[PDB]
């Protein structure tokens, strides 16, 4: 109601000729009275007779050039009597009732269009009732003003998306009501389309090129997130709009996958022409997920159900990759809540950035393939009767999950703990392993470390006996060789 | 001693209020031309609402010497300078009405009267007075609205406020010197 | 039926042939203004009244003046008429004289101004209460302050209310 009363108090109008002619009316009709008040300033020169009279007189530039003190009077106090006593004067007092009557007629007319003007404002009373209904409790009461000016102009209120932690650019929400009793969702860009216009979900897609190593034939399979193509978000229903707001949250989430795109740019795995980036990794040549440096997931396709083993795995990717940047969205807020400056400006060294989509690629590919290859090299030590085992032991030694210890604070401790158990996933370097012998007893051991998908294998070995002898060394070519040297210094 | 002290007793008083309604109109006239932007709907009502008030004081200032001035009725005789360029004198000394007088007729004719004389006219006066007396009835109804009220200091403070746990300044004084906070 | 009321035009060219050059000017004004009602003309007619010979019988050392007359000071035949006018209209007190309905003038070069008045006298003051009329090129002006104000004043306001009516903008 207040906003709408303020709108009527903003002079505002978009009229061509209509708006134009009216303001010209003001100019001339106001100017008239301005100019006639200047005859009033001419009566001022009419005084003359005094110096303060001259002051008043200079009122006309023509008085500046018409020197005279000019005028003189006599007495008709009798004529004052005639003005007052005349039958004409009695009658003229009737011109007082007459003009005053027509003024009262005007008054009545103005007054009535006023209650009908309050009736267009009841459209708004209803809109506020509509807003009272629907989206409520926890939710944005963002109050905004646009169309510039800074005062008056256009002003209203609503919620938006990013909040705690900072993606950074073009992130928010803005909401208004149509005459169909439905709410239209503005975004301050992401340009309106009641509960959106066009929506892009993040999407995913994983290909494998095998052919049993036959013709370089690659197929994909994609974990699909489609609630439906049919849209409801009913008019007059903010509850359905709350659902549309949840859709809006998902759209804001895709913006996060844009940061992951950029975080790819720090790696050697596909980004082609600077116009499209493709996620892909060497082994069995396979590909996992995508979204063009142009965008992510934009909706228009045929709809059939068939699945595929690639497809099942692919849904696992999206949730991880998605999840992984909630982590980022979390360790950002750790710093913010925790220390003064704030976190702003996001992932220097692409250390913070890299986590998203960088550690997943690493994880899958590196530790795993390299461990497999280490195992073949450990088959070069496959020769002795022997034995040799792997643990989470390196993993156990650092980066504990859900520990009671906490940090500085009770409030701080909780969030730190939340980070930790999810932190396993983000930390995913290879654990490492060992092998041993007894009978006057010897012992050796190796650790696989991924540092950014590059693989180090650092080993150890001690032969425990009456007098102690030992060596430790920290590349895969040398590892093969070290194993050959170990055979000689072992039993054989 | 040669020529005369003619008139203009409250003339200065008219001039002052003549000017203020000129001054407030003139300024609105200057802005009225920058139709590029209107001054803020508050601003124009501040200037055009005290600019209308200016003409109330200028309206009344006319009646207050109103017996005196119609009686004075000065028409000019002057320097011959006034005679050359002529009109300025016809213009500057002329009272009439504009196209204005006409909606004055529209209004006069809008009333229920015109040529029916004195006895019937005196009666209409008593009748309009009766309308004003039926307007007093507004006084009676205003009593019903019955709305007039007010917004011992100590009596009211107990209800209202107990605010302050201590002296801010003294607290600090202590932290810095070990001077200890005394009763405030 | 319409009135020219609060002074209007002249009577022009009609005693421009009879010729206006002061003194005669006053009489020309009389016809023109349609405003000589009693005394000045009455003085004119009584002398003008004799029309050769029917029967019409009824009774009917220099420098001294009025204060305004002393300020004015009259030059030529109109000065002689002035004596006649005093004679026509003079209520008499000890050191004083008052007039009824005389019409008279004050002038310069191309134009003048004239009043029709009543004088009240005394040793140290004397005032004439009258009507005043200015007279340039066959036109007469008779005007009133307070009436003068109501003029472009009501005009200012009706035009301000046109302005206020125009504030019918959003």
């Amino acid at each position: 109601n207040e906003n709408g009363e303020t709108d009527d108090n903003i002079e505002t109008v978009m009229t061509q000729e209509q708006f134009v002619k009216r303001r010209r009316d003001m100019l001339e009709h106001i100017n008239l009275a301005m100019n006639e008040s200047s005859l009033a300033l001419e009566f001022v020169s009419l005084l003359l007779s005094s110096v303060k009279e001259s002051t008043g007189m200079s009122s006309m530039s023509p008085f500046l050039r018409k020197v005279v003190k000019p005028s003189s009077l006599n007495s008709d106090k009798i004529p004052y009597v005639a003005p007052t006593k005349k039958e004409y004067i009695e009658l003229d007092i009737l011109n007082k009732g007459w003009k005053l009557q027509s003024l009262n007629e005007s008054k009545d007319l103005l007054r009535a269009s006023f209650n009908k003007l309050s009736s267009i404002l009841q459209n708004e009373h209803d809109y506020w009732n509509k807003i009272m209904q629907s989206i409520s409790n926890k939710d944005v009461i963002f109050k905004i003003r646009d169309r510039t000016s800074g005062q008056k102009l256009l002003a209203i209120k609503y919620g938006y998306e990013d909040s705690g932690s900072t993606y950074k650019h073009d992130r928010g929400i803005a909401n208004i009501r149509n005459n169909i009793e439905s709410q239209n969702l503005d975004l301050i860009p992401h340009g309106t389309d009641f509960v959106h216009s066009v929506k892009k979900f993040l999407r995913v897609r994983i290909f494998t090129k095998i052919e049993s190593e036959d013709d370089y034939i690659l197929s994909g399979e994609s974990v699909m997130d489609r609630d439906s193509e049919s849209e409801e978000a009913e008019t007059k229903d903010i509850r359905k709009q709350i659902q549309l707001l949840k859709k809006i949250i998902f759209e804001k989430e895709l913006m996060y996958q844009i940061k992951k795109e950029c975080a790819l740019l720090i790696s050697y795995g596909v980004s082609i022409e600077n116009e499209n980036k493709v996620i892909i990794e060497l082994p069995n040549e396979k590909f996992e997920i995508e979204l063009l440096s142009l965008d992510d997931d934009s909706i228009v396709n045929h709809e059939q159900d068939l699945p595929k083993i690639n497809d099942k795995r692919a849904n696992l990717m999206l949730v991880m990759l998605r999840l992984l940047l909630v982590v980022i969205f979390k360790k950002t807020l750790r710093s913010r809540i925790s220390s003064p400056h704030g976190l702003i400006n996001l992932n220097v060294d692409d250390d913070i950035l890299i986590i998203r989509p960088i550690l997943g690629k690493v994880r899958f590919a590196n530790y795993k393939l390299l461990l497999k290859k280490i195992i073949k090299d450990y088959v070069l030590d496959i020769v002795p009767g022997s034995s040799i085992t792997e643990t989470e032991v390196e993993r156990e030694q650092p980066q504990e999950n859900k520990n009671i210890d906490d940090e500085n604070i009770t409030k701080l401790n909780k969030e730190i703990r939340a980070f930790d158990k999810l932190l396993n996933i983000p930390r995913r370097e290879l654990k490492i392993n060992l092998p041993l012998t007894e009978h006057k007893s010897p012992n050796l051991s190796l650790m696989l470390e991924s540092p950014n998908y590059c693989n180090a294998l650092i080993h150890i070995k001690f032969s425990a006996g009456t007098e102690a002898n030992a060596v430790s060394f920290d590349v895969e070519d040398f590892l093969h060789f070290i194993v050959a040297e170990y055979i000689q210094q072992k039993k054989v | 001693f040669d020529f005369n002290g003619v008139p203009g007793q409250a003339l200065d008083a008219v001039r002052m209020r003549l000017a203020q309604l000129t001054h407030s109109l003139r300024r609105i006239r200057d802005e009225m031309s920058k139709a590029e932007l209107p001054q803020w709907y508050t601003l124009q009502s501040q200037l055009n609402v005290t600019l209308s008030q200016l003409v109330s004081v200028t309206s009344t200032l006319q009646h207050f010497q109103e017996t005196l001035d119609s009686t004075v009725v000065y028409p000019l005789p002057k320097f011959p300078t006034t005679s050359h360029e002529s009109l300025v004198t016809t213009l500057l000394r002329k009272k009439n009405i504009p196209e204005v007088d006409e909606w004055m007729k529209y209004v006069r004719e809008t009333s229920g009267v015109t040529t029916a004389l004195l006895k019937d006219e005196e009666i209409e006066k008593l009748l309009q007075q009766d309308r004003e007396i039926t307007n007093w009835a507004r006084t009676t109804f205003r009593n019903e609205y019955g709305k007039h009220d007010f917004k011992h200091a100590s009596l009211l403070v107990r209800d209202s406020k107990p605010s302050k746990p201590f002296n801010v300044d003294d607290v600090l004084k202590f932290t810095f010197t070990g001077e200890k906070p005394i009763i405030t | 039926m319409n009135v020219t009321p609060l002074d209007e035009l002249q009577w022009k060219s009609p005693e421009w042939i009879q010729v206006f050059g002061l003194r005669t000017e006053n009489v020309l004004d009389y016809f023109a203004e349609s405003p000589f009602f009693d005394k000045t003309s009455n003085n004119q007619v009584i002398k003008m009244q004799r029309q050769f010979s029917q029967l019409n019988d009824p009774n009917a050392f220099a420098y001294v003046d009025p204060a305004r007359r002393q300020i004015l000071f009259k030059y030529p035949m109109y000065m002689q008429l002035e004596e006649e006018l005093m004679k026509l209209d003079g209520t008499e007190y000890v050191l004083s004289s008052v007039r009824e309905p005389d019409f008279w003038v004050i002038r310069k070069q191309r134009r003048t101004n004239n009043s029709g008045v009543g004088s009240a006298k005394g040793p140290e003051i004397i005032p004439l209460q009258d009507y005043y009329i200015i007279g340039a090129n066959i036109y007469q002006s008779p005007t009133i302050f307070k009436i003068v104000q109501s003029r472009l004043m009501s005009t200012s306001y009706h035009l301000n209310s046109t302005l206020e009516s125009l504030y019918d903008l959003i």
Binding site: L41 | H23, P98 | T4, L9
Partner: peptide, 25 residues
């Protein structure tokens, strides 16, 4: 004190204040 200088506008081209009737003989 009041403003500063006094706002000219002087005008003989306005609507009109004089009528006209006392000619014909």
């Amino acid at each position: 004190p009041s403003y500063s200088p006094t706002s000219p506008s002087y005008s003989p081209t306005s609507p009109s204040y004089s009528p006209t009737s006392p000619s014909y003989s």
